[PDB]
Amino acid sequence: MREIVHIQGGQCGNQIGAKFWEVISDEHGIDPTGTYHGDSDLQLERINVYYNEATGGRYVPRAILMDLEPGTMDSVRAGPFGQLFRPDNFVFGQTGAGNNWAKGHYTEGAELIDSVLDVVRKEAEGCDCLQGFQITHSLGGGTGSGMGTLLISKVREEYPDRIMETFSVVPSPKVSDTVVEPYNATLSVHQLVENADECMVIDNEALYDICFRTLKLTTPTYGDLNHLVSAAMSGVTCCLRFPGQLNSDLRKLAVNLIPFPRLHFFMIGFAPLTSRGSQQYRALTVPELTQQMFDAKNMMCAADPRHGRYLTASALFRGRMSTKEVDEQMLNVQNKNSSYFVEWIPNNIKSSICDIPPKGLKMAVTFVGNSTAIQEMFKRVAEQFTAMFRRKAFLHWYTGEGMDEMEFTEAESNMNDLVSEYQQYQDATA
Amino acid sequence: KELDIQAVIGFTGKVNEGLILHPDNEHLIYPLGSTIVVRHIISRSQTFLRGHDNQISIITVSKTGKYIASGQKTYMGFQADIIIWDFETRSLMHRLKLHKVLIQSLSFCCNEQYLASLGGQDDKNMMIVWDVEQGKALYGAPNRDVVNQIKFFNNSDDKIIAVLNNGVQILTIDKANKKVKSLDVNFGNIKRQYTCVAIDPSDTYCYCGTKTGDVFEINIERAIFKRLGPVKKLFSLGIGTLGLLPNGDIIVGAGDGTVAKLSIQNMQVLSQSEVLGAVTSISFTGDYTHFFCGTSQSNIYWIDTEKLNPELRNTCHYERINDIAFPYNYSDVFATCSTTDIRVWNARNRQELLRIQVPNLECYCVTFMNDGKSIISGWNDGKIRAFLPQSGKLLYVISDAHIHGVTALSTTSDCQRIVSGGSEGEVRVWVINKQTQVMKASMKEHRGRVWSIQVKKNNDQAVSASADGSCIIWDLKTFTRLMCLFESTLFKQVLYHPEESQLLTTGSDRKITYWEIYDGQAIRMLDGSEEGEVNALSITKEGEHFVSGGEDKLVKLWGYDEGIKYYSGTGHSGAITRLQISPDQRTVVSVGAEGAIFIWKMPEEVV
Amino acid sequence: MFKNTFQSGFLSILYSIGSKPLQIWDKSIRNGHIKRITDQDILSSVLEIMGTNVSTNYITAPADPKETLGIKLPFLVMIIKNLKKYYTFEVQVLDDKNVRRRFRASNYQSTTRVKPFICTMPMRLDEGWNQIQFNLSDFTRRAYATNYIETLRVQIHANCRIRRIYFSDRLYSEEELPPEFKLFLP
Amino acid sequence: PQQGNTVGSISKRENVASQLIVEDHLKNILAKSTNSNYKPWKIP
Amino acid sequence: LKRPNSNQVRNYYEKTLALKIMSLDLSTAEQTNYSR
Ligand SMILES: Nc1nc2c(ncn2[C@@H]2O[C@H](COP(=O)(O)OP(=O)(O)O)[C@@H](O)[C@H]2O)c(=O)[nH]1
């Protein structure tokens, strides 16, 4: 019932999903061998959402793994919970994109897209009734940022009515891992804005800041960052998979969070996060949860929200508690922070509750907010883009594979516009 | 003086490799909640080792049957203590104080002179070496990532193995310099998580288990691995324990509970079998046949080799007995509440009789019914359930009786009604009838959770004791006349005196207090340890003596008429909570919150 | 099964786009094979049964015998791809009298005969995909001059690729067929 | 397209370990495959 | 093949055999030794 398929493109997305599936299997009581060994009956009532049933009682995730090089799939196949992935869905190239969006989107991606399109189409007809699709990828890598959004355009062409998530890792200048980030970043986001029903921005420098500050652990790793991202992943669809007093699905979020068709860029967060030094000192209560999930340092994004006003926000609580107290901190935090909320949309806070908490924690919360502070990433990325582009540096490699300067010009103009109308409503008054 | 104990029902399968068959045999050692026990096998004798404060975490023994090492987990503020017991003397030969919270593993060399201890995840995974003759910390090693276990080599004790969470590490220790050298065994594109390890007698190869369920094979002379393990098939919850036959055959324990053997060939099972509970301990007997298995659910199994058929030797309680009961004027059988599943046991022979299982609920105050009717229990959700005696099917369920779980129950003799108590001071009366179950409670208010309700012989009068500090006596006919007895502490068991007017009551204070409905106190017994909370009491049909038990390990019975203790009870571990006396009164039974069950021979001269 | 249940205009028994398209269906295979593939002519997944000795390879309307699929509906309809091979399908029906009759349709039969229990009919299939409408009403009224109450069973034999089998209840047109019911042309 | 699919086929068949590797030429493969890009040296 | 110890192997033998029969019950003690 109302399932979603899960597909990865690019090594970043593959690594995210690799242990996203681990988290999902753990919370559903699924072993690395596909055999259910949970204890509660509710663990089995809604497993078709992510797992297909195979002969012998085993379950296989409905995930399609895709990349233009075989190394990352070769590694993830031997990774933990790698046996669940069915060998057929592995679609790999033979050359690699060279972090070049042209090789990732026109020459190699266009010819390679046919097999993955066939597989995703068959998988789509496989499920009973489809909710939509959700993506995990990075805009900073050539193969991902190009051919993933290519696939996005194709799939949105064929299924106009479904809802789509895109959890995207944006580049930042603090931790910069590649010299050509602005080019492929703007090229990917220009196409993504026109078709993305919802975009979830994730910042790795923000991840480092969180894992440094909130938990006080000395040496975090890509695994820990993936853990935070996976918790954010599971928090969204906990409510669709488990019962609750106020059930709200992906279409619920789409209705309640998007005022206008071009305003679909979101920043997310997860709570609670505690050190191993203070977990049993700290007493977890609803006010503590809410003050953490509205904290500026708990957000997965580097953009500071107090430089803008929230257009809207939504929160999903997990665990056993009544709803009226939740409502009262919502109203109190809306009252004392009325300066940071837009004044012509009262009651811009969505609340949802699920009665099954995550394993090991009796209460949890996931926050997703559409705010007027997102313009910072776009302006700084555009500034980097024009800094690279006014001297035509790194340009001949793109223009030698079907690119011209006109596409870059249109992408830059479109992004500047998107910034303009995204910040226009910040100054709007009733 | 001291009171005899005839039987003990206790075992803790939570700690890995807990069950150990002492080399030269005839001796079997296992940890109780906080004390170690050793048992002679040909004879029926046993001995207690009590030199600990908290729950034991690790048990290890040397080769050739020399001294034993035991380690426990403590609070963050203090430090865990490692206790070395000399065997054949049953004496604490050494005590060592280091590490922050808990110790993960202990290792003995082939020679008995050296020791290795491993701290918990807290203290930042500190590895320490010790000298047995004099407690000395020659040197140590801190490492960032967690290491689940460490083992010494069979020969060449200078080389040791550590199954770190990321992978395998080989450590070299030299006498010339206190330094320790670390080499990390490299795996090509492998991120398996590793818990258990074993070493072949030739010390060439080591077999290490995985959380996925495939056993890896690594030579020590190099960082190269050879084999992943059983191909095309896994064990579905990781690898619990490893054992090596003289053939090189590898006996493996799976997390789900599974015993299988792999030849030194293609990793294919020659024989496979299924065993209840998660596997926790495997001990090979001398000549390596018919070994012992210990589950995570406190079950002891006798598993044959090369033809894997599981045979259940004996079963023990899982954890945390909550209460005990006898049938009315019957002592052959007694029932125990558990964390999840009620059990019934025979007094003469303590083999299990029948279990009634509930998935995720705690029971409280299981109450028997005369005329052989159903057994009644209350659960966390607030529901009350009745089950038939021979077979565990329910007669009926009462739903939403109390908001936060029924705590105590009491039955009238003529059995048409039940009285029940909730946590939030609600005492209710229900009229049972074969057709239907109804309630006519007063919904009387009573602040704290009620721990005990008693009904007199004529069955009209019924007293209930709260946590708040009030023991209220109810007429049960008009549900009124609220005169309630006052003292300021957390109450516990209350009892009528059989065919008298006095109430023998207890509370959190270290005093057993004789009361009456007229605030008449015969004596204030004041049976106090340093921080004891006397909790369980029982009375003989003739008021000669009463049995009393605190939170402390000691349990004692006192003469009713005069305030002098006769005899005493020891050998318990943890907090003793319930003390009953059989209707025949030939024994006294006690249930310990750490999984132990004790039956005591009541002294002869109290008849 | 399908008794005391609503039906007004349509009722779909089998469709090849779903997690478990055939649950009520029971399959018996001796030398054949069953699986669903995306079709080249229609870009969609289509269930397929194939094999030799078309009689022995079939799928039955109930998972098990000894009970009925009670259906009041008059008009059957099927979407079949013409593969230029043998094909048979039959339907078992209840009349006014408590009698069970059956109509078989065969690709390889050339003569039609009426009999108290069986009424065989030849059929002709045009090239490519096609949907066929089975009246069954005039059919029973002509074969035995007795009206119909309920249609017990439906049976499909080997060598065919199937997309939808449903009850349409009356002659309809493509425009009034909802999008799922209509076959979108390649 | 024809080829490029074949070469991709070997890789996923190789990813299954099963204590074995499939280089595509293991057993009953012609007389013998040339020991280098050129034919072998006299002393191996 | 190596020659095993005739006395040692038979000693392990009847030791394990007797342990089999006498291992049926572990509850009864009849020798308390609470202190030691
Ligand atoms: N969170 C996370 N980020 C990653 C991971 N691997 C790479 N990245 C980020 O992705 C950027 C490079 O992406 P790239 O490898 O070129 O993507 P690709 O071209 O699709 O393979 C780097 O700046 C990294 O910060 C990962 O496992 N987790």
From TrEMBL, chain B:
It is found in: Cell projection, Cilium, Flagellum; Cytoplasm. Disulfide bonds join 337-363. SUPFAM superfamilies: WD40 repeat-like. The keyword Membrane does not apply. Keywords: Cell projection, Cilium, Cytoplasm, Flagellum, Repeat, WD repeat. SMART domains: WD40. WD repeats lie at residues 399-440, 443-484, 494-525, 527-568, 569-602. One of its GO terms (cellular component) is motile cilium. Belongs to the CFAP52 family. This is Cilia- and flagella-associated protein 52. It comes from Tetrahymena thermophila (strain SB210).
Automatic annotation (TrEMBL), chain C:
It comes from the Eukaryota. It holds the Pfam family CFA20_dom. InterPro entries: CFA20/CFAP20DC (IPR040441), CFA20_dom (IPR007714). Residues 1-184 form the CFA20 domain. PANTHER family: ORF PROTEIN (PTHR12458). This is Transcription factor iib protein, putative. It comes from Tetrahymena thermophila (strain SB210).
From TrEMBL, chain D:
This is Parkin co-regulated protein. It comes from Tetrahymena thermophila (strain SB210). The chain holds residues 6 to 49 of 319 of the full protein.
Automatic annotation (TrEMBL), chain E:
This is Uncharacterized protein. The chain holds residues 250 to 285 of 298 of the full protein. It comes from the Eukaryota.
